[PDB]
């Protein structure tokens, strides 16, 4: 049996158990991935590698993560690109930026990427996003083009509470985002 847990209700200016990439940093008790500037990327990863499945027994881990994030845009019409929670190889660097959200490099299935991500997409990219043009939550597997999505109405500046859980018995990944109002 192997378990890994951690909880951070308020970030410190020197959060040494986190790895920062791009514009990522902590300040004012919060974790800032990007400020309101153009063409940029920021990432933050938990320091310790996680044992998600066992080669010997073929067992896969159950896991649950919960977090509160905020998106602050200059207005409600021009918002981009989004935010993700992701699972990737141990030594990973930022991938393509913009609509690729820093975790993928194409809309076609690339098995070498070895990345699963839950996206909170705020900008409609014609080449691959849902034709309805709505902002949306999506589950991504080795591709920026989600295997499934759900229209999501962004509440600018509001705290969104997220729970992402994985059930190893059924291989089901569940995502839920809740706004207090």
């Amino acid at each position: 049996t192997e378990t890994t847990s951690f909880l951070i209700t308020k970030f410190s200016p020197d959060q040494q158990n986190l790895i920062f990439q791009g514009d990522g940093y902590t300040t004012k008790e919060k974790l800032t991935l990007t400020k309101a500037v153009k063409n940029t990327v920021g990432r933050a990863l938990y320091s310790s590698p996680i044992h998600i499945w066992d080669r010997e027994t073929g067992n896969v881990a159950n896991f649950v993560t919960s977090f509160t994030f905020v998106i602050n845009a200059p207005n409600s019409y021009n918002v981009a690109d989004g935010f993700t929670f992701f699972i990737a190889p141990v030594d990973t660097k930022p991938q393509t930026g913009g609509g690729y959200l820093g975790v993928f490099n194409s809309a076609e299935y690339d098995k070498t990427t070895q990345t699963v991500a839950v996206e909170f997409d705020t900008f409609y990219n014609a080449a691959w996003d849902p034709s309805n043009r709505d902002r949306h939550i999506g589950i991504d597997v080795n591709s920026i083009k989600s295997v499934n999505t759900k229209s999501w109405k962004l509440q600018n500046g509001e705290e969104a509470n997220v729970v992402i859980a994985f059930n190893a018995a059924t291989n089901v990944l569940t995502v839920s985002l809740t706004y207090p109002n």
């Binding site: 940029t40 920021g42 977090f67 098995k111």
Partner: protein, 48 residues
């Protein structure tokens, strides 16, 4: 209170390595916004 839920089947073992790192990412392009995280908890259990 406004909630949104989404679910799907993902065969983790066929997609990611035995050992991984978890994290957050956010980007901007021609259009932008600030992306912040206020709290974070995580728990995983691998039986056997």
């Amino acid at each position: 209170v406004t909630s949104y839920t989404l679910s799907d089947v993902v065969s983790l073992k066929d997609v990611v390595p035995e050992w991984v790192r978890i994290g957050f990412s956010a980007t901007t392009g021609a259009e932008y916004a600030a992306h912040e995280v206020l709290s974070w908890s995580f728990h995983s259990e691998l039986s056997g």
